[PDB]
């Protein structure tokens, strides 16, 4: 997250760190949202590589003991069947991870609330992106979980020629684009939390930013629109 602030450690208890094994260590690669005690929602592109993955819930500082973490293996990966790694602009950037154990819930570990199917946010709706991704274009991961206020940019604006054009689909949410605040590498897969009727819900799964840079004016961060995938998510959980 470029232009973020440090989250409070109990603000976003559905945020997870998706990590892969590197030698004798683990490296953060992506975010995700805990949606059942044994299921995480992330981006398909985050699990394209044939790596060993684990999820960390209750994580605040990637580099320090928080006293709240639970570490759990990934047992099954279900990518959306229309996902194509060569075509992130086509959409379907969503995957479900079945965890090897069910995590324990507390103030640091909670299920993410998803929107009702079909819900579309008004232009300029208040949202926060969260993650441990790079804090500058071509920079380095955050140590502590970051948040940035990224108001939505509706499909009509986001898909206009001065923004993303035909690269954005109605199956996506755009947010931000102010040139200061954005998602960045390492935030992919994580949530966009939007305040609706007094409650935060996870409306987006971070999918991409511009090849030119993270915080680029009129290139808002692009997310998979969770409300387009409610039936798919329910069908996967019910069949696994």
Ligand X SMILES: *C(=O)c1cccc(C)c1
Query: What is the contact surface with ligand X in residues (CB under 6 A)?
Result: 45, 88, 133, 185-188, 206, 208-209
Token pair recorded at residue 168: 């954005």
Residue 66 binding result from Ca ion, ligand X, none, given CB thresholds of 5 to 8 Å by partner type: Ca ion
Select 56 or 226, whichever has its Cβ closest to Ca ion.
56
Across-strand partners of 106? 109
- Between CA 18 and CA 188 the distance in angstroms is 10
Q: What 3-state DSSP class applies to 157?
A: helix
Q: For residue 66, state whether it binds Ca ion (rule: CB under 5 A).
A: yes
Q: What 3-state DSSP class applies to 9?
A: coil
- Between CA 213 and CA 231 the distance in angstroms is 34
Select 57 or 141, whichever has its Cβ closest to ligand X.
141
Binder among 61, 137, 143, 167 for Ca ion (CB under 5 A): 61
Residues 6+ apart with CB under 8 A from 197: none
Q: How far is the CB of 200 from ligand X (least distance, A)?
A: 21
User: Closest-CB residue for Ca ion?
Assistant: 66
Q: Is 45 known to be catalytic?
A: yes
Catalytic annotation, pick one of 188, 207, 210, 227: 188
- Between CA 187 and CA 181 the distance in angstroms is 13
User: Closest-CB residue for ligand X?
Assistant: 188
Q: Is 11 known to be catalytic?
A: no
**What is the tally of helices (H) and strands (E) in the chain?**
2, 14
Residue with tokens 């931000």: 176
The answer on whether 59 is annotated among ligand-binding residues is yes
* Binding-site positions for Ca(2+): 59, 61, 64, 69
> Which residues of this chain interact with Ca ion, rule CB under 5 A?
61, 66
The residues annotated with a catalytic role in the active site are 45, 93, 188
């Amino acid at each position: 997250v470029v232009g973020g602030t440090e989250a409070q450690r109990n603000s976003w208890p559905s945020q997870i760190s998706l990590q892969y094994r590197s030698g004798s260590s683990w490296a953060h690669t992506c975010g995700g949202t805990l949606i059942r005690q044994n299921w995480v929602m992330t981006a398909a592109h985050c699990v394209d590589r044939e790596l060993t993955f684990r999820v960390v819930v209750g994580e605040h500082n990637l580099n320090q003991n928080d006293g709240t973490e639970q570490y759990v293996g990934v047992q099954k990966i279900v990518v959306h069947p229309y996902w194509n790694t060569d075509d992130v602009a086509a959409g379907y950037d969503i995957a479900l991870l079945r965890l090897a154990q069910s995590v324990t819930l507390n103030s640091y570990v909670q299920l993410g609330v998803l929107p009702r199917a079909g819900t579309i946010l008004a232009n300029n709706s208040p949202c926060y992106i969260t993650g441990w991704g790079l804090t500058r274009t071509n920079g380095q991961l955050a140590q502590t979980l970051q948040q940035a206020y990224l108001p939505t940019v509706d499909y009509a604006i986001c898909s206009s020629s001065s923004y993303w054009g035909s690269t954005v689909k109605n199956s996506m949410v755009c947010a931000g684009g102010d040139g200061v605040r954005s998602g960045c590498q390492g935030d992919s897969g994580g949530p966009l939390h939007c305040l609706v009727n007094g409650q935060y819900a996870v409306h987006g799964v971070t999918s991409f930013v511009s090849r030119l840079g993270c915080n680029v004016t009129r290139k808002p961060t692009v997310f998979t629109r969770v409300s387009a995938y409610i039936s798919w998510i329910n069908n996967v959980i019910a069949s696994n």
